[PDB]
């Protein structure tokens, strides 16, 4: 559908660093990553939710990936062995990648995080709730109603109905 | 006037006086039907047409009501039809510009000589 | 005279179908709006 | 293939003209053919069936061609376009009808009938009317046609308004 | 052409079904079976359309529920017919 | 490839269907057709839910009537002809090699399987039948199901009225 | 949708029977149309819904868009048949699977 | 409601099914209603008491089922290639939908099933097929708007519809041919307008309803039976039989009121040629009706000897000849009808 008159981004604009991480890699660091960077995501894919045109969300998307990148670099520096083991459980242990089979490693990895940043593992569903947030993009689309001035009119109930003219106005009045 | 005005030509200016027969006709048609139908009933059943006048009175009563009931529906119906037509003329005066009445002295027709 | 006028008007009103009368065919968005409402009702409901 | 008999002068493009007729001739011919081969003749086999279709179609080609050429001949030589021209056209058509039918009386009487048909057809072509004109009126119900709804779902308000723009 | 590449196969099968429905068969069972194949093709056209549609998909059941009822009625009248004449053979018609 | 091979198998079986005249042979032919059509609709669907459904109703239960009442058997068993089989094999193969030749994509449908939907689509990450079958039960489009069940009830009242001719 | 003449209480079962609109990109186009059909009836509206019907049809129907592709790829094959495209150039690069 | 209680049930389901069609919003819904009609009607038509009923059942089912099959199929195509129920214009997508509907209601080229039906059907079963099984397909034909196909149907809706009626001696087949001719008038009338079509069908329903409802009463099944049917006076033999001329709608019989209405509006559309043809054939329709009325116009014929008395139901006879009396003096109610404006 796209045409040469349409506007698209620059190659350089798209060219930003991405995670390169595996499923087990992400799903291991999920929880302690979710609460560190949620504003990034929230306003990011909030504008995506309300407005679908991705051309504008590119900037905040770059922020989202950067923020996640920052967290894992901290993880890389501080708790490597703990996190890696937790990752190794979470995939080797099951083909469904469920947290309910190596919680012991999950606990010890939490200990290391408790020692380094002293952050707390969020609730069972801390991200399951709604996300009511502040407005940063500040672009509510306009709520509007269409107007067809020349729509087909009928007979209002106030239009006066003078009693009939010339009986039934038929052949012999009847 | 000398001006063929569609709206005013249509307008219920009046001059429509109902006869003594004008409203009464339906009542004395439906009732006459129902009475005749009861006579029709007894005629085929080999019963006295006079006999069992309860059938005739009931047939008369139902018919009279319907004629009055339906006379009413028509009069509403006709009134509305005039309302729409006057509305549409008022809606599209451009489509029906008022036209002017002329006289034969201003026209030339072609006649038929029998000869 | 009025009868001739009525036919002419009936001719125009059928040609254009402007007015919501004999020569009209009303449509209905009600059912689409209703289904729109059902979709609204159940989107917010999703998820336990 | 796609031509109109009556969109040209009454004496020009004979070949295109006959084609514009023969198409409306063959349609009837084969149409009746499939209609009756299955009812009466029922000739088992494909050549016998080809025979019935041939028997049915050819005569109607004879009718159309005879009418067209005689009447085209008239305008070419008689130099006019008259009701009488189609009348001789119809006479020729039924003469072909008698020839194929091998019923002398039946052909002649139909030739008169077809002449009447052509006469009326010319009247339509020249008096600016038509047999099956399109409709000027097509009604959809009483004045309360909009008011005959009896549904029982609540309809939330609309997304469109008749009122003028407020910009 | 869209129909020629996509809706063509359903057409070719559907027409073949009808011709078999008007062919010559000792009894009517081949006919009922013929229209039954047509129902499957009828489902085929119906589903590819309902697949154009995000959720209107579910209408399959409505068509299926109705279609099986036609077949049941079909077998109903046939089987009662053998029982009546001791046969439902087209020679009886 | 599977899709167009499945067209080919349906075409071949269809040719089988129009030839066979023994009722079992026809009823057998329907059986294969049903598996094939279930496979095919499944491919172009969001999932195979409907395929499993119509399988167990149409084939699983309802073709039992057709085979059973068509157990007339002709009084004798099949005279199978290895020739129509060989033609069936022959027609299948060069259709199959053409399938290997035909354009990989353009010869495929365009419908949107669960996989062929875009990643962003937040709706697609639900149970595959949840959102499809939603409004079969949620108002105001669920009463029609009530009509279905009563229709089936009435269907049984009809069957006992037709299947109860004095015995 | 063709208008039930009588519009009795049993249009109330099948009128919302199956709806284009809900959870459909074309549904937005359906509303852009169906409001107008309500405004201009079903006969003047069918006259004056040129763009509305065009796009609504195009979204679900995909006729215009899809046929554009079919000619687009045929033309790729046609140059191959003329020999312009060789074993390498005959196809373009593969979009990253995680796209679309 | 003929013999059993189930007659009421299937009639009810039938009504609901057909009522769905006329109120159907989309083609699919209309198809749904049509099949429900197909169910509900087969058991009434297929009485288990006799034979002829059952053969009519296969033909009715084996025809209607194909009609519904094609109808839905052509619906999908139209509502694919147009992606919308109301196509912009009538193309090849749409003629098939009419051809489905025309067969379903038994129109001109697709009628042969319909006479063969009548042999099987009893009277009110026939009646019920005559009147009500033609509403839904016709009201749908209203939505379809292909001029020329309806026109060919109207052309051929009287030719066969009257020429055959000349030939039949079984009252069952005559009613078939009589209606096919009348069906010609409805189809033209619906091409013109719908409100007049609604009226004309209703008067046709009324007239056909009374007609066959007495034939049910006296069980007169063959022209011989009509000549032989005892009546005490051989005067009501003649008074009752005016309705056979109300079939032709000759002014003092109330069949004129609908035919006048259709003619008035049709010529207002200026399809004068079509009127001439239908109205030419109308005479042939009225022709064999006089062929029927040789039994009653003259009086005091040659009769069978054994009969001495003639008897019939109270309910049916009481209802019947009220409807007849209206068929006699109906016109003067010119005022009572206000639906023509």
mmCIF file of C-alpha atoms in Angstrom, chain G residues 10-43:
data_model
loop_
_atom_site.group_PDB
_atom_site.id
_atom_site.type_symbol
_atom_site.label_atom_id
_atom_site.label_comp_id
_atom_site.label_asym_id
_atom_site.label_seq_id
_atom_site.Cartn_x
_atom_site.Cartn_y
_atom_site.Cartn_z
ATOM 1 C CA UNK G 10 -38.032 -11.408 14.595
ATOM 2 C CA UNK G 11 -35.575 -9.304 12.652
ATOM 3 C CA UNK G 12 -34.236 -9.095 16.215
ATOM 4 C CA UNK G 13 -32.609 -12.525 15.878
ATOM 5 C CA UNK G 14 -30.739 -12.331 12.579
ATOM 6 C CA UNK G 15 -30.158 -8.599 12.131
ATOM 7 C CA UNK G 16 -27.066 -8.690 14.313
ATOM 8 C CA UNK G 17 -26.585 -12.297 13.140
ATOM 9 C CA UNK G 18 -23.071 -11.807 11.826
ATOM 10 C CA UNK G 19 -21.430 -8.396 11.927
ATOM 11 C CA UNK G 20 -18.527 -7.129 9.849
ATOM 12 C CA UNK G 21 -17.712 -4.399 12.295
ATOM 13 C CA UNK G 22 -16.532 -5.992 15.515
ATOM 14 C CA UNK G 23 -12.751 -6.383 15.866
ATOM 15 C CA UNK G 24 -12.154 -5.738 12.170
ATOM 16 C CA UNK G 25 -9.985 -3.167 10.440
ATOM 17 C CA UNK G 26 -12.667 -3.135 7.743
ATOM 18 C CA UNK G 27 -15.161 -2.543 10.534
ATOM 19 C CA UNK G 28 -13.999 1.049 10.791
ATOM 20 C CA UNK G 29 -14.817 1.317 7.097
ATOM 21 C CA UNK G 30 -18.169 -0.352 7.721
ATOM 22 C CA UNK G 31 -19.086 2.391 10.164
ATOM 23 C CA UNK G 32 -17.853 5.046 7.746
ATOM 24 C CA UNK G 33 -20.339 3.529 5.306
ATOM 25 C CA UNK G 34 -23.287 2.336 7.343
ATOM 26 C CA UNK G 35 -23.818 5.733 8.930
ATOM 27 C CA UNK G 36 -24.232 7.239 5.462
ATOM 28 C CA UNK G 37 -26.604 4.481 4.364
ATOM 29 C CA UNK G 38 -28.649 5.476 7.386
ATOM 30 C CA UNK G 39 -28.470 9.112 6.303
ATOM 31 C CA UNK G 40 -29.307 8.724 2.594
ATOM 32 C CA UNK G 41 -31.427 5.612 2.705
ATOM 33 C CA UNK G 42 -30.394 2.574 0.708
ATOM 34 C CA UNK G 43 -30.835 4.007 -2.813
#
